[PDB]
């Protein structure tokens, strides 16, 4: 345990998040998408010695939707339970980098003030929080998962316009959903849910985030 | 004799109870199938069963040949009479 297999987890979670970022539209390199565990150890020169800062090594920037806002950032805290101290240093790093988005992946628990500070952060800036064990398996790989697409405000505008649909009338979607957390979807935003239909052949629905 | 081989993933008793059940089912089915053959097409009963009315072959088995095993929740009748069902039976009896 924590001797070799751990690298596989760190590899698989790295690919899962990269695919997630890739799914977010960020131009992850195919090789990063394609790399093997053997290559993953090779890419990081992994395991010259034990308990090495792989989580510091795993820490990465990801960047590229086709809309060049650029610069999303992913950080992996070394401490299982993350404190405000690491959050301030992180806050300093994201500020100094002036990144647009920061994703922090915590191993275990957190102080509620850090949890609070993460929630509020800044009215004009976003910080993202992901638990490592939940990342350990890509839920979107599951067969029961429909295709989810975030809708542009104009698409939402067009959607309401075409139907004369009232905002209330739209089914709500709870932001407590892991998948909601996956898209990084915000409240009030709409996600396009694409489903197979045993009747239509194809069924599309939408839900506003609550 | 304890020379009986238990079914993998099951106890010997589970095998034994299962094994006796296949036999009581195969025989009844065989003897039933004999009765399905034994009846003329002239019969009202076969006429009633074939037409899709309220009847079947199992009925024929029950009326003509054999009702079959009675069970409790699918299990053979429990030994409510102290390792027996009735005082007419010998102790440790396992007859159907």
């Amino acid at each position: 345990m924590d001797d070799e297999e751990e690298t596989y987890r760190l590899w698989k979670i790295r690919k899962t998040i990269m695919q997630l970022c890739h799914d977010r539209g960020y131009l992850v390199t195919q090789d990063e998408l394609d790399q093997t565990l053997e290559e993953f150890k090779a890419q990081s020169g992994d395991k010259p010695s034990e308990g090495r800062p792989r989580r510091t090594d795993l820490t990465v920037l990801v960047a590229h939707n086709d809309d060049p806002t650029d610069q999303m950032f992913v950080f992996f805290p070394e401490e299982p339970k993350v404190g405000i101290k690491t959050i301030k240093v992180y806050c300093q790093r994201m500020q100094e980098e002036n990144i647009t988005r920061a994703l922090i992946v915590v191993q275990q628990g957190m102080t509620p003030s850090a949890k609070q500070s993460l929630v509020d952060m800044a009215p004009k800036y976003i910080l993202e929080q992901f638990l490592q064990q939940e990342l350990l398996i890509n839920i979107t790989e599951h067969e029961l998962v429909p295709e989810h697409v975030v809708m542009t405000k104009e698409e939402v505008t067009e959607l309401l316009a075409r139907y004369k649909l009232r905002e209330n009338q739209l089914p709500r979607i709870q932001a407590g959903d892991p998948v909601a957390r996956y898209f990084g979807i915000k409240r009030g935003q709409v996600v396009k849910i694409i489903r197979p239909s045993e009747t239509a052949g194809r069924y599309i629905t939408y839900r506003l985030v609550q | 004799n304890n020379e009986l081989e238990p079914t993998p993933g099951n106890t010997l008793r589970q095998t034994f109870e299962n094994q006796v059940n296949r036999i009581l089912n195969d025989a009844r089915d065989k003897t039933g199938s004999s009765a399905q053959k034994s009846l003329s097409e002239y019969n009202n009963f076969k006429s009633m069963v074939v037409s899709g009315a309220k009847g079947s072959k199992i009925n024929i088995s029950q009326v003509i040949a054999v009702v079959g095993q009675q069970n409790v929740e699918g299990k053979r009748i429990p030994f409510g009479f102290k390792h027996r069902t009735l005082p007419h039976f010998i102790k440790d009896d396992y007859g159907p």
Binding site: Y163, L165, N168, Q169, L170, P171, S197, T199, A200, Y203, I204, T205 | -
Partner: protein, 48 residues
């Protein structure tokens, strides 16, 4: 007591007593179930 709250609407969309949308259309086609029938598509034919 649960299902009494829902009915079909004239815009084909399925809605409740407070007019909120359940479905884009009833059964995702808006057609009557009685007019449906068992059929073989047979396009899943073995050999291409």
């Amino acid at each position: 007591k649960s299902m009494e709250s829902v009915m079909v609407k004239y815009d084909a969309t399925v809605r409740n007593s407070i007019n909120q949308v359940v479905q884009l259309r009833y059964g995702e086609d808006g057609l009557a179930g009685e007019s449906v029938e068992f059929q073989n598509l047979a396009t899943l034919k073995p050999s291409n």
